Nucleic acid binder design. Sequence first.
DNA 1: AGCGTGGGCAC
DNA 2: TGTGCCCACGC
Length: 85
Amino acid sequence: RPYACPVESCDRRFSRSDELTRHIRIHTGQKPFQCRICMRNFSRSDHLTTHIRTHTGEKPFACDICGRKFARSDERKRHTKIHLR
DNA sequence: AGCGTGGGCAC
DNA sequence: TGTGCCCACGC
Ligand SMILES: [Zn+2]
Ligand SMILES: [Zn+2]
Ligand SMILES: [Zn+2]
């Protein structure tokens, strides 16, 4: 863990430098990815893709047990466990 | 539930 | 560097 966050108040450390560059945006407040539907800005392209699904209703992830659909795989992952008991 | 959003990391 | 998942936490 060689790459430490330069911001004094921040004591985060990272493996690869590209991680520090992404992380540094939490301090600069930079959000280079905009949703052309609601005009909101996001820090990351992947979070914008999933955000947009809230507008379109696209839900590519279906539960293997009941078939319920989700916009994100983690929502599906969190849901699937309700079938156990 | 709905979903923002940082961290780890593959390609 | 850029793109894009998984993973996990938070409200
Ligand atoms: Zn920092
Ligand atoms: Zn939007
Ligand atoms: Zn289910």
